[PDB]
Amino acid sequence: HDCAKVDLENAELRRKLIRTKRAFEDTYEKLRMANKAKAQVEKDIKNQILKTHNVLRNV
Amino acid sequence: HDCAKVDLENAELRRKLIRTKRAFEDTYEKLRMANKAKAQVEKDIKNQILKTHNVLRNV
Ligand SMILES: [Zn+2]
Numbered sequence A, B: 001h002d003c004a005k006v007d008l009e010n011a012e013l014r015r016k017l018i019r020t021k022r023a024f025e026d027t028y029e030k031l032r033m034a035n036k037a038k039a040q041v042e043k044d045i046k047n048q049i050l051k052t053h054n055v056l057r058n059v
Helices: A003-057 B003-055
Strands: none
Touching: A003 B003
């Protein structure tokens, strides 16, 4: 048994295990931001139609 | 340290690392097939946006 190496390996595994989770969280939020972005798009076009309609109402 | 406890923790760290990797693999594979299903819809949407983009060319 290598007491120095096993403590070092556990520190390496724990450190990297944390690196892995935070990478996913970033991705999760990134996907979360992307989906909400395309959600807005459907409403933006609907909004644009209303404006254009209101513009042509003024006649 | 505690050689018995640290080795058991080391086995736990590797174990948890395997679950995360398999969790990613599960997600990736599920996502890979899922994207292929929605892919026809996505190109159709891209075309209408592109078409509408082309419509606004009039100046
Ligand atoms: Zn030891």
